[PDB]
């Protein structure tokens, strides 16, 4: 999670993170690509039948 990692328990960083744009939209959708592929990797090796 972006906001509560780089700025723990500080509500002023929520204002400064949104004006950097779609960095955290990209980073969350990047790591979700790994987080759905690992389900696909285990289903690929074991579930041929």
């Amino acid at each position: 999670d972006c906001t509560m990692y780089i700025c723990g328990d500080s509500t002023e960083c929520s204002n400064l993170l949104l004006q950097y744009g779609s960095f955290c939209t990209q980073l969350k959708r990047a790591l979700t690509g790994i987080a759905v592929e690992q389900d696909k990797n285990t289903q690929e090796v074991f579930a041929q039948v």
Partner: protein
């Protein structure tokens, strides 16, 4: 704010006890997580959000 310990979080009682030369407590992140209480002699854990 425990004599300059700036931060926001909820407060619980910690079962562990400090030595008389100890006042603070760190972690892997090197930040305050459980400290001795200032005006009373028991150890309080700062549970985060």
């Amino acid at each position: 704010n425990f004599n300059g310990l700036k931060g926001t979080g909820v407060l619980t009682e910690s079962n562990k006890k400090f030595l008389p030369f100890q006042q603070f407590g760190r972690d892997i992140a090197d930040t305050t997580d459980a400290v001795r209480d200032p005006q009373t002699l028991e150890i309080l854990d700062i549970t985060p959000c």
